[PDB]
Ligand binder design. Structure first.
Ligand SMILES: O=c1ccn([C@@H]2O[C@H](COP(=O)(O)OP(=O)(O)O)[C@@H](O)[C@H]2O)c(=O)[nH]1
Lengths: 365, 364
């Protein structure tokens, strides 16, 4: 009976947008996702039969502020506004006071003065504080940065991203055949699953690969973000510099991530800036793979070092080489760790459990 | 204290003209923001009141440019003073984001007969939640705000103010102006507004027909593009009743105080309730008898028989009765008119009104 108006600024399927697919699904017969840009995320939502619409600035409030006005008027036939990004929060907060509907802010970013303008930090935080009935944080790191930026602590609740655990299971044979098709059957494959961007640190994996035995190869899965083509150029040159051209594959964007992860021997998350929540980390754990992650942000809540994956100082390529080598030398311990990771991640990040937490939290408003 | 005034209109309506008086004592530390260019902008410039037009051309900068520019500007000021409905909507948004107190100066009767229920709900909700203070230009405005669901405890009535001494005209200018208009020997009923059906000129004209031949009327004001059918209807009405030599259209005039003084009665005959009859007060300050339609703000401005006359809206025979009373009891009439000047100078002196505003702002 509760109808939700979800709002997301981006027309591109980023992590938060992908998360929103899962959040919205149980509500598809009683929800709408309003976007502020068209794009492939719109396609996806349509694929999932999640009602979706694009809200633009195209022409009393109607003329003063078209976007806000459209949101306000849509909000009238909904019971709650669920804002999924920063700009959606700003617009959602205004819409909430005008349309007289409760607001939920789902926080997916680390609200950091280094990646957000102090302008937007103050505005986002103050709007949340005064108008959000609840701020869902995707991790404790996201939670504390919100608080540190002046966010009200008592408004927050941590709810992790949820995953359909059975999608991450692949047979040994499918693994073998895919590895052959990738020509890595006799390699130690380290997989990196991220859009190519400097803060994702693919260059760190490349430097580590320089200090690894020759059987170690890398697969970079993900396409280049608009404006990062300098970075992608730096990588190719970095690689050629190091003679690694035949030991690194750029697969570009891939939708078959679980299968590709299953073909790897280790999954590496090498971000140089604190990660709010690494989806790829949890995905790798669900695939039953050893995982190594930079020791900042949400990654520290996802992995316990030595138990269900490995943590390394961000930007330190040698430390990453050492974990890679330890995985190569300590076969048994590594398999155990990887098995632990599948069990713990299934318990913690099952979409069924996450959807229950979301439902409970929403109903308690 | 620096004040950011906001007003939706580029045209100098009553609210906009009132804002000139309001802003003058603060003009070295204020800005008026308009949501459209026009003559009002020119008038502000004439008075050295800093002015600026905010538009929607280009993170809120992209999402809502107009709002974003107001917010941004508002950071430089200590208070946002919204003078109209739309300025309230925008100003409330800007008020929390920039973190500045907001005042709403309500110049309108928020009637569900002249505003859609959404604009009423939105204005009332925003004011109730974000206004530190709602200034109403009259008890009529105040009570309509509250009947729409406005928070009564937020309201204070502050009337429009006038420069008292502008409404004083010598008997020699009066005689000379009556001579030039050719009304020296007439009982002159003046009507001072633009030609519009809601302003009720046709009412005065029907009353003229129930009046002795020495009663003439002067209609002072021009016509709007939109009310051209009305103008022709007036001329036809005048010819049909045989009043063509007892009505003079003077067109638009800047010397209103002087023309009021040349009248013997000033007639306010609007057909719809108004928040605050500027013309009624001006007639009082000119020391003239004034008859007004008994609705809206008029009712607060006049005590019937004491300092002017109130007549049922739309009723020309009542109006004619008043006009004939003025002709027959000249002494009672001159006393009423003298009473009018004294009470209006007391209640609507801009010096006093400015003090009420200043006091009211300092309590925030
Ligand atoms: O080629 C790719 C690369 C990534 N992803 C997905 O994109 C999301 C990236 O999320 P993450 O939280 O790891 O990155 P962020 O968006 O925080 O930078 C994950 O679900 C990945 O499985 C994908 O579908 N195809």
């Amino acid at each position: 009976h509760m109808k939700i108006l979800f709002l997301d600024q981006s027309g591109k399927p980023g992590g938060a947008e992908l998360c929103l697919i899962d959040i919205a699904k149980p509500y598809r017969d009683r929800a709408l996702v309003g976007l502020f840009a068209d794009g492939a995320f719109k396609t996806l939502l349509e694929q999932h039969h999640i009602p979706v619409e694009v809200f633009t600035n195209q022409p009393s409030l109607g003329q003063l502020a078209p976007l806000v006005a459209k949101v306000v008027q849509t909000a009238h036939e909904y019971d709650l506004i669920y804002a999924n990004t920063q700009k959606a929060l700003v617009v959602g907060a205004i819409a909430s006071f005008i349309a007289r509907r409760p607001l939920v802010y789902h926080l997916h970013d680390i609200l950091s003065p280094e990646h957000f303008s102090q302008t937007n930090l103050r505005v986002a935080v103050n709007l949340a504080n005064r108008f959000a009935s609840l701020v869902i944080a995707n991790s404790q790191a996201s939670q504390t940065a919100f608080i540190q930026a002046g966010g009200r602590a008592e408004l927050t609740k941590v709810i992790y991203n949820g995953f359909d655990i059975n999608l991450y299971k692949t047979s040994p044979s499918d693994i073998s055949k895919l590895r052959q098709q990738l020509g890595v059957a006799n390699n130690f494959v380290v997989g990196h699953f991220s859009r190519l961007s400097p803060w994702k640190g693919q260059h760190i994996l490349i430097d580590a690969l320089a200090q690894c035995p020759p059987q170690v190869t890398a697969i970079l899965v993900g396409d280049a973000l608009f404006g990062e083509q300098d970075y992608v150029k730096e990588l190719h040159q970095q690689i050629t510099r190091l003679g690694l051209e035949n030991r690194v594959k750029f697969l570009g964007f891939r939708a078959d991530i679980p299968q590709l992860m299953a073909a790897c021997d280790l999954v590496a998350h090498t971000s140089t800036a604190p990660e709010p929540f690494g989806r790829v980390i949890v995905e790798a754990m669900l695939c039953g793979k050893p995982v190594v992650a930079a020791k900042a942000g949400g990654a520290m809540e996802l992995v316990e070092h030595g138990v269900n994956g490995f943590l390394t100082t961000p930007g330190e390529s040698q430390e990453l080489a050492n974990i890679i080598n330890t995985c190569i030398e300590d076969t048994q311990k590594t398999a155990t760790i990887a098995s632990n990771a599948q069990a713990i991640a299934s318990q913690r990040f099952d979409v069924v459990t996450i959807n229950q937490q979301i439902a409970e939290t929403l109903s308690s408003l």
